[PDB]
Design a protein around this ligand. Structure first.
Ligand code: CA
Ligand code: ZN
Ligand code: ZN
Length: 60
DNA sequence: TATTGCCGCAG
DNA sequence: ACTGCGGCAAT
């Protein structure tokens, strides 16, 4: 009916759409171009940097 | 064909 | 607590 036609050429993992595959490929590559300005830790995109930022709040 | 914002799932 | 993951929508 649930098709996962996009797939990785090094491990065959399948995806519903091109976005999951884009992210998966970049994860194999270690391509994490956006970094936390506070600690330097790198993430795949700005959204994931932003989610990380709360690490740096004083707890509670 | 591409990238990421948004945000939920799971460990 | 923290983050890898990935579906959907938008672009
Ligand atoms: Ca999901
Ligand atoms: Zn793969
Ligand atoms: Zn940080």
């Amino acid at each position: 009916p649930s098709e996962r036609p996009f797939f990785c050429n090094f491990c065959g993992k399948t995806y519903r759409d091109a976005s999951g595959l884009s992210r998966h490929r970049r994860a194999h590559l270690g391509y994490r171009p956006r970094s936390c300005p506070e600690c330097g830790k790198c993430f795949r995109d700005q959204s994931q940097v932003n989610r990380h930022l709360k690490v740096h709040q004083n707890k509670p």
